[PDB]
RNA sequence: GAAGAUAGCCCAAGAAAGAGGGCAAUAACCAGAUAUAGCCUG
């Protein structure tokens, strides 16, 4: 990469912008490059590549013969341009470079012929010598000087397609090279239109001397800009380049013409938009079908553009003639693909030239009056064709159909309009809606650019927006999951009341018959009002932990456990659509005293929980309580805010390698001196040490001052250490985390500097242990104390939560973070915490880079606060949830009425041979039965009662029972038999960690897999994968919802700022009710109110037929209804909300989009299973992202990545399904829909693990066939597939 | 107004076409350890 040293940014000074290069990390005054240094930096990077320049880059008998031919051509005395042109003590280097400059200039100025060296500052005799050096004769001599083989044309064809330098891969250059090589090897060849000197050799010299980049790259950087900038009148519009050259000024004029299109198109009169889309449609028809197409004959034919679009789809015309397939041969298919790409390009050029001529000669009302707008669109069309064939992965007939291309380009043009309105709305929303912020102002104005942005937008500004929008969208996902989890055991929703958060409090009566409760009254959905409080408290660690809590102090009056449920629901709801940017916020309607007291109650258990994790991880089995007490106080006396982009403990200390690592005498030299329970005690020890080291890593090691200094000293390796010294040079106070982040600084996850960081951290940690926790080196196995006896004096020494308690008491916003994170699974809460960390680091990094480049930056987004509250407090709250979500009660009765219902629940996942009687006894019989030899099943029973199984309870609180039952098979006796058999077979080398034999490793892997089954850990895995698939779907929902609002904002902002007719209340609302307010820019205010929880909407009420203002807390659905009643007066439309949305989506499918969004966000899949994950992802791909190609076209890759993260490789096939258009209430029609499926044969395979041994390496499937089967069932259910054929091994 | 994905946009260039650069700006990628043999290898 050319600018690998530097970063680029766009800065905006006084409504003029500049693309800058800057060195990072650097100090202010040493970072941003001035014009000369930018120029020289580019020059220097270009001339870097000069002397390694070779025509050709870089086992089968032929494929290795090609490689040998290339190498001989590239070896010395071969075709080495640096040697050839530097001859005679570099005396001609300047002349040759000047020749290259004039050769390039001759192309742009249409000057025919190679330059003569006489005009490069050189006499006539020398010119003859130089011309000979860069002649075909000399090239032929240099090319064959190292070759003593007989090469064929096919060898030449293969070498060119496989090894030719990318900058030389243009048709005429490749043809020139082929002609030269055929002449060099005395093979008859004719290509009369090609001149070897001009088409190949002269071009090579232009490439060698980088004449294009030297004259263009620096200026192209300087002219970079953002998508939208303010104009003179303080209005945002799409950015237009300042041009400066002949072609650049034409390009700017076309862009200005499209800017005018966007203004004119934003018309509430749908006839204006229809006519403009028809003119754009005619341009597409002209481009692909020529000026004599029947739809271009009558210039005033108001043909339906979508009917024409549908017509070209079923058209069979071929855009190009495809060559016949080959006699696979990957070399021959690459040749054919290159031939096909050149065919597309030739036809594209012809189409372009024909269209340009026709819009010049045969317009007369067919196209746009503005010639520059027709040219803008023709350039978009040409570009769109190139996007398709430059991409080309596989030559296919469907992609060669003219109607495929015309309709791809049509949707591409609509895409471009869509993303520009969205880009406008993004600027308006972020920078021209200040007065959305809560105030006492009785008159506000929306759509005026905030003072700090009138001089324009920088790239750093948009980085800050991305940081905030990412966290907002990530948080939105967790709000949905928290609502799901709270709803899952408290209510049974139905299809008409599927959103838990929109259920109404217990006193809500029907509006039309006040004798009845409203249909959405929460009472109608309660699963069991009598156990409601105890059910809720399962999510607060079990009601047994709350026996001392004065609930009745807070549920006084008629308030009961239904109001308790309603208050928690209200906390969660208050975070939905809660904008981080616009505070509406700190006034929660729920019982803040109750929530605050519950938080304080939970903080009181934290020291007990953390010390209990030492106990439960068996640390007091190997170390003295007093030594562990010292450690406990060190680790937990202060809440620790973790920094992002520090390598995880588990990557620095790989669990599989851990026992060998701690025993290594160069590291720690720990050897535990231990009969029967030997291996089990060894395993307990290494598991205990792993947990203790993990806690030390995060809570003591990473922030230790001495660790940092020693890491820097101890720290390719010269490169690594060089950047470290640069980093600390730039700021000596950078923490170790910040050094790691600066060091660590393709859409598809890849199947089968970081190491230096892991190594230096691993060694620094071992030394930290030796220096500070030396008692760790001397473990001694002894008996576990009673749990209550282990450091019972612990809470006396530390009070980490003292300050946070009072801050949560006084913050509605902290209470939201608390309740939302607290209702997540432990893995989800951990992910939420990680997103917070990533947000904080990103914001810090942006300000850091803005600062070093001297870029003024409005601190609307703070480094230390979010939504008004300290990030450190949010962090501590979420961290409290992470820990407590994973702390399961020891009382079965906290989760089930008795051992019998518990045992019956276990039977959903375990076949303990239920006879038909009592479950508790059938399970007790099963655990007391013999499994293998003298091995009894055991596992699932703890003396008198069934064993409390952590994974079972976690699946009950946070997983989806019917889903898990549908995608897995219950654990069986034979599973438990196999578990014990592999236990035995591995019992003698289990903590070796890194093994000698190959079948030792494979058996260890098999045991690990069986342990995961009998422990229900695979269940947790599948639940997390489903949560990740569902979470990504919800993420996409909030991506779309953001961009729908932005589209509407940008479109109506454009409308407000054009001359089209606008009614009074579109521009200005003068609300004279008791909460009176005047709103200038009313349409913009009302758009944003639809999407912001807490922002009132002004409308004419259905029942009173009078103007009112809402409290702003009603649902998005209610707000859309209210918006309709606001707009309802408008005469120039019938649906203002939907104005322009034909660009964003297919209007006829709007209700299906809403239905899909609701299906996902209301978790309906888990109740009905009427469609699969693949089917939902298919419908998202098909029509959820109509508004922006860049989201739509990554939908399958994102799915593939999620699976690959879990070591599952899937091969997609794209086929056809069905979708409805419209929603019956009866006008829904069915049609074809994209269907993403998986190849029926060998479509799913496991990633391989690389296991190192003593010998060498063995490759083992990460995931066995049984695991892969459940993944396929997860993806396909309710559909069933032949998994034997689909799974590869 | 189906889909056959594995980008998209900005800047530059450009009709005898051009075809370079940039993007934490834009999604993805990378990274992140919550709990006891589950995320190896690089």
């Amino acid at each position: 990469k050319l600018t690998v040293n530097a970063k680029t940014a766009v800065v905006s000074e006084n409504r003029s912008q500049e693309g800058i290069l800057y060195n990072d990390p650097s100090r202010y005054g040493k970072s941003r490059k001035n014009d000369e240094d930018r120029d020289r930096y580019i020059e220097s990077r270009l001339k870097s590549s000069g002397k390694l320049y070779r025509i050709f880059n870089e086992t089968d008998e032929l494929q290795w013969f090609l490689s040998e031919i290339v190498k001989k051509i590239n070896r010395r005395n071969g075709l080495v341009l640096s040697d050839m042109l530097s001859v005679d003590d570099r005396a001609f280097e300047k002349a040759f470079e000047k020749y290259a400059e004039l050769s390039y200039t001759n192309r742009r100025n249409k000057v025919s012929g190679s330059p003569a060296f006489e005009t490069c500052g050189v006499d006539a005799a020398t010119a003859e010598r130089l011309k000979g050096i860069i002649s075909e004769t000399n090239f032929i001599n240099r090319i064959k000087n190292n070759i003593d083989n007989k090469v064929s044309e096919d060898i030449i064809d293969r070498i060119i397609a496989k090894y030719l330098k990318k900058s030389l891969c243009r048709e005429r250059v490749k043809r020139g090279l082929k002609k030269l090589l055929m002449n060099a090897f005395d093979l008859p060849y004719s290509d009369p239109d090609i001149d070897v000197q001009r088409d190949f050799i002269d071009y090579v010299l232009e490439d060698f001397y980088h004449v294009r980049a030297k004259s263009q790259v620096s200026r192209s950087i300087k002219n970079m800009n953002m998508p939208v900038q303010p104009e003179g009148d303080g209005k945002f519009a799409i950015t237009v380049s300042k041009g400066g050259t002949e072609s650049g000024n034409k390009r700017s004029a076309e862009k200005e013409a499209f800017k005018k299109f966007l203004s004119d198109y934003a018309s509430l009169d749908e006839r204006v938009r229809d006519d403009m889309l028809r003119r754009m449609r005619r341009l597409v028809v002209l481009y692909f079908y020529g000026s004599d197409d029947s739809k271009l004959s009558d210039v005033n034919e108001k043909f339906d553009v979508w009917e024409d679009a549908a017509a070209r789809r079923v058209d069979n015309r071929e855009f190009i003639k495809l060559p016949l397939e080959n006699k696979t041969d990957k070399d021959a298919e690459r040749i054919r693909k290159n031939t096909v790409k050149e065919l597309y390009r030739n036809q594209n050029i012809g189409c372009y030239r024909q269209a340009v001529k026709a819009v010049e000669e045969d317009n007369n009302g067919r196209y746009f009056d503005d010639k520059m707008l027709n040219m803008f669109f023709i350039h978009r069309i040409e570009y769109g064709v190139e996007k398709i064939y430059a991409n080309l992965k596989q030559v296919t007939e469907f992609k060669a159909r003219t109607g495929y291309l015309s309709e791809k380009i049509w949707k591409d043009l609509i895409n471009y309009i869509s993303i520009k309105y969205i880009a406008m709305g993004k600027a308006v929303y972020n920078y021209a809606m200040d007065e959305l912020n809560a105030s006492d102002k009785k008159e506000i104005e929306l759509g005026k650019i905030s003072e700090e942005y009138l001089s324009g937008i920088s790239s750093f500004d948009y980085e800050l927006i991305k940081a905030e929008e990412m966290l907002q969208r990530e948080t939105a996902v967790y709000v949905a999951f928290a609502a799901r989890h709270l709803s899952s055991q408290t209510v049974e929703l139905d299809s008409e009341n599927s959103d838990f958060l929109l259920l109404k409090p217990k006193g809500t009566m029907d509006k039309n018959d006040k004798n009845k409760l409203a249909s959405n009254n929460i009472l109608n959905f309660l699963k069991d009002k009598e156990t409601l409080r105890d059910t809720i408290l399962q999510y607060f660690g079990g009601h047994s932990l709350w026996t001392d809590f004065p609930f009745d102090k807070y549920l006084a009056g008629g308030k009961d456990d239904v109001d308790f449920l309603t208050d928690l629901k209200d906390v969660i709801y208050s975070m939905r659509n809660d904008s981080f940017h616009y505070a509406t916020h700190n006034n929660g309607k729920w019982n803040k005293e109750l929530i605050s007291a519950m938080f304080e109650h939970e903080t009181e258990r934290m020291t007990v929980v953390m010390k209990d994790k030492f106990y439960s991880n068996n640390l007091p089995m190997f170390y003295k309580n007093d030594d562990l007490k010292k450690l406990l106080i060190d680790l937990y006396k202060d809440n620790v805010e973790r920094a992002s982009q520090v390598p995880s403990f588990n990557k620095v200390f790989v669990r599989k390698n851990f026992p060998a690592l701690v025993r290594d005498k160069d590291n720690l030299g720990i050897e535990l001196d231990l009969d029967a329970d030997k291996g089990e005690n060894e395993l307990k020890f290494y598991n205990a040490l792993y947990y203790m080291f993990k806690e030390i890593y995060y809570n003591a090691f990473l922030n230790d001052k001495n660790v940092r200094e020693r890491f820097i000293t101890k720290a390719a390796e010269n490169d690594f250490g060089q950047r470290i010294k640069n980093i600390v040079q730039v700021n000596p106070d950078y923490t170790l985390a910040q050094i790691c982040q600066l060091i660590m600084t393709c859409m598809q996850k890849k199947s089968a500097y970081k190491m230096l960081l892991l190594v230096n951290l691993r060694k620094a940690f071992l030394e930290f242990i030796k220096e500070n926790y030396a008692f760790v080196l001397k473990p001694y196995k002894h008996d576990l104390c009673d749990k209550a006896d282990f450091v019972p004096d612990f809470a006396k020494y530390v009070k980490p939560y003292a300050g946070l308690i009072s801050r949560v008491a006084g913050s509605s916003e902290l209470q939201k973070w608390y309740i939302v994170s607290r209702f997540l699974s432990p893995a989800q809460a951990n992910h939420m915490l990680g997103f917070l960390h990533s947000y904080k680091q990103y914001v810090w990094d942006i300000y850091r880079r803005a600062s070093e480049t001297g870029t003024e930056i409005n601190h609307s987004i703070a480094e230390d606060k979010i939504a008004g509250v300290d990030i450190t407090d949010v962090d501590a709250v979420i961290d409290l949830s992470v820990k407590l979500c994973g702390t399961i009660s020891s009382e079965i009765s906290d989760y089930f009425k008795d051992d019998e219902v518990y045992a019956e629940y276990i039977s959903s996942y375990l076949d303990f041979e239920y006879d038909g009687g009592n479950y508790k006894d059938s399970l007790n019989r099963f655990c007391n039965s013999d499994a293998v030899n003298d091995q009894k099943v055991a596992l699932y029973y703890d003396g008198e009662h069934p064993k409390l199984n952590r994974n079972i309870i976690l699946s009950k609180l946070y997983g989806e029972r019917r889903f898990l039952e549908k995608i897995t098979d219950r654990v069986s006796r034979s599973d438990i038999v196999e578990y014990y058999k592999l236990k035995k077979e591995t019992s003698q080398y289990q903590t070796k960690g890194i093994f000698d034999s190959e079948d030792e490793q494979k058996n260890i892997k098999k045991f690990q897999e069986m342990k995961n089954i009998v422990e229900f850990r695979d269940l947790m895995d599948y639940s997390e994968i489903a949560d990740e698939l569902q979470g990504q779907l919800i993420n996409w929902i909030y991506l779309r919802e953001r961009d729908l609002m932005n589209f509407q904002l940008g479109y109506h902002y454009a409308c407000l700022n054009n001359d089209s007719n606008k009614q009074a209340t579109y521009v200005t609302l003068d609300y004279q009710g008791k909460k009176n307010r005047k709103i200038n820019g009313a349409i913009l205010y009302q758009i944003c109110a639809m999407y912001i929880n807490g922002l009132p909407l002004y409308y004419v009420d259905k029942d009173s037929s009078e103007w009112t203002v809402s409290d702003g807390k009603e649902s998005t659905g209610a707000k859309i209804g209210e918006f309709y009643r606001y707009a309802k007066s408008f005469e120039n439309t019938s649906d203002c909300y939907a104005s322009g949305l034909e660009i964003f989506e297919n209007i006829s499918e709007h209700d299906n989009i809403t239905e899909l969004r609701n299906y996902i966000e209301h978790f309906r899949y888990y109740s009905s299973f009427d469609r699969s994950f693949l089917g939902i992802y298919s419908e998202v791909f098909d029509r959820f992202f109509t508004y922006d190609l860049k989201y739509r076209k990554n939908v399958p890759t994102i799915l593939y990545n999620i699976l690959l993260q879990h070591f599952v490789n899937v091969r997609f096939e794209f086929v056809s399904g069905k979708k409805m258009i419209g929603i019956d209430k009866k006008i829904a029609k069915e049609k074809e829909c994209a269907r993403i499926t998986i190849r029926e044969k060998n479509g799913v395979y496991s990633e391989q693990f690389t296991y190192k041994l003593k010998n060498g390496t063995v490759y083992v499937d990460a995931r066995d066939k049984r695991y892969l089967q459940s993944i396929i069932r997860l993806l396909f259910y309710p559909e069933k597939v032949n998994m034997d054929e689909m799974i590869e091994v």
Side-chain angles (χ1 to χ4, degrees), chain A residues 514-554:
Chain A
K514 285 137 154 208
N515 289 291
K516 315 215 192 71
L517 319 166
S519 54
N520 54 5
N521 185 307
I522 188 133
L523 297 166
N524 296 323
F525 304 96
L526 291 174
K527 276 173 154 182
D528 190 341
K529 173 167 165 13
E530 301 318 306
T531 58
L532 180 52
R533 180 189 297 183
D534 282 4
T535 305
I536 294 166
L537 292 176
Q538 290 175 33
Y539 295 92
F540 294 91
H543 73 260
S544 78
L545 306 169
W546 297 83
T547 65
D548 77 320
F549 190 77
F551 282 109
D552 283 333
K553 166 177 184 161
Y554 307 101

Side-chain angles (χ1 to χ4, degrees), chain A residues 626-898:
Chain A
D626 277 344
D627 294 2
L628 296 174
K629 170 205 281 304
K630 177 258 201 293
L631 180 55
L632 281 164
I633 295 169
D634 287 352
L635 296 191
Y636 305 131
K637 63 186 163 178
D638 306 314
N639 285 335
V640 178
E641 188 169 4
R642 286 188 206 173
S644 69
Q645 287 277 0
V646 177
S648 73
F649 170 76
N650 306 67
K651 295 278 195 62
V652 176
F653 290 90
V654 175
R655 183 46 179 87
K656 161 194 181 46
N657 307 334
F658 189 63
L661 191 133
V662 299
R663 288 192 304 263
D664 196 291
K665 285 174 194 155
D666 288 327
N667 302 326
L668 296 180
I670 307 174
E671 260 281 34
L672 176 79
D673 291 336
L674 300 174
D675 59 347
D677 323 296
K678 176 179 198 283
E680 212 206 330
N681 280 352
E682 193 137 19
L683 179 57
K684 280 199 214 318
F685 170 67
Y686 288 120
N687 283 339
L689 197 67
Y690 201 65
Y691 178 75
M692 168 169 56
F693 279 10
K694 188 262 287 180
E695 291 292 304
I696 295 175
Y697 183 81
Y698 291 115
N699 295 283
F701 164 73
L702 288 172
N703 304 325
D704 182 87
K705 177 248 150 211
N706 292 325
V707 162
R708 178 197 171 267
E709 309 282 6
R710 284 230 36 82
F711 171 97
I712 292 168
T713 293
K714 260 187 281 229
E717 199 141 359
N718 173 68
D719 221 315
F720 199 82
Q722 200 55 253
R723 314 173 93 88
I724 304 276
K725 282 283 78 197
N726 184 217
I727 286 164
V728 296
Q729 254 154 40
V730 174
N731 195 329
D733 304 335
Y734 279 156
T735 65
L736 173 61
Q738 294 169 326
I739 298 165
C740 288
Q741 297 160 356
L742 293 177
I743 280 298
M744 283 295 225
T745 318
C746 185
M747 306 151 89
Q748 215 153 86
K749 191 170 331 302
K750 320 171 96 183
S751 68
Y753 263 29
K754 210 163 74 164
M755 280 50 154
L756 285 182
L757 195 53
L758 299 172
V759 167
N760 279 272
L761 281 173
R762 186 191 294 116
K763 297 324 165 201
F765 183 88
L766 296 167
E767 172 172 73
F768 178 74
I769 294 291
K770 278 171 279 200
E771 282 292 330
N772 297 269
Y773 294 112
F775 75 82
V776 166
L777 311 176
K778 296 287 151 269
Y780 75 114
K781 199 262 162 175
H782 59 294
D783 294 311
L784 264 186
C785 40
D786 279 313
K787 180 149 122 183
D789 290 350
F790 173 64
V791 196
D793 40 318
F794 177 47
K796 179 217 311 162
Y797 288 76
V798 306
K799 303 285 160 199
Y801 289 94
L804 187 56
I805 294 164
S806 62
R807 292 196 291 275
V808 168
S811 174
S812 283
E813 181 72 16
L814 281 178
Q815 294 181 10
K816 296 182 205 172
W817 287 100
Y818 172 45
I819 295 300
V820 168
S821 67
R822 191 65 177 89
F823 271 93
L824 300 176
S825 72
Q828 287 174 327
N830 177 73
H831 285 322
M832 186 180 203
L833 190 49
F835 281 131
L836 182 73
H837 297 162
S838 292
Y839 170 81
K840 185 180 184 163
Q841 199 275 337
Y842 191 11
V843 169
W844 168 91
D845 190 67
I846 298 158
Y847 280 120
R848 179 186 69 75
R849 288 182 281 103
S851 172
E852 84 193 348
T853 64
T855 305
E856 300 101 303
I857 196 157
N858 176 246
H859 299 268
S860 77
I861 286 133
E863 289 174 61
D864 55 352
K865 291 169 124 80
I866 178 86
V869 301
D870 286 358
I871 289 163
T872 301
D873 289 344
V874 180
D875 192 288
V877 168
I878 301 182
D879 174 86
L880 171 140
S881 287
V882 172
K883 287 153 167 168
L884 293 190
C885 291
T887 304
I888 301 304
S889 176
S890 47
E891 302 298 332
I892 293 163
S893 55
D894 276 344
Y895 304 107
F896 301 88
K897 179 44 182 202
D898 46 45

Side-chain angles (χ1 to χ4, degrees), chain A residues 427-474:
Chain A
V428 169
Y429 178 72
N430 282 283
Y431 304 133
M433 301 292 290
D434 221 307
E435 315 214 324
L436 293 181
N437 280 301
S439 69
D440 296 359
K441 289 184 201 163
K442 297 275 198 157
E443 177 159 3
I444 52 174
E445 180 176 357
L446 289 311
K448 61 154 139 47
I449 302 181
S450 272
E451 183 271 315
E452 319 88 270
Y453 300 100
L454 278 170
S455 287
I457 301 163
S458 76
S459 54
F460 304 101
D461 290 330
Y462 267 31
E463 292 190 278
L464 289 172
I465 290 171
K466 193 201 174 34
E468 184 174 74
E469 291 186 347
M470 295 281 280
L471 183 66
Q472 188 96 72
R473 187 164 63 254
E474 294 143 6

Side-chain angles (χ1 to χ4, degrees), chain A residues 83-133:
Chain A
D83 298 343
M84 293 158 62
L85 305 190
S86 59
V87 63
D88 211 355
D89 290 323
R90 314 217 191 63
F92 313 120
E93 286 182 341
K94 267 292 136 207
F96 282 133
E97 182 197 38
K98 167 79 148 314
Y99 179 95
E101 299 276 350
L102 295 192
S103 175
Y104 172 50
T105 297
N106 278 9
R107 297 186 197 277
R108 334 174 73 214
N109 285 87
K110 324 153 222 74
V111 179
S112 205
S114 312
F117 276 102
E118 285 81 357
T119 66
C120 307
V122 153
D123 50 284
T126 300
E128 212 60 48
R129 181 186 179 193
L130 300 198
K131 171 183 149 115
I133 288 179

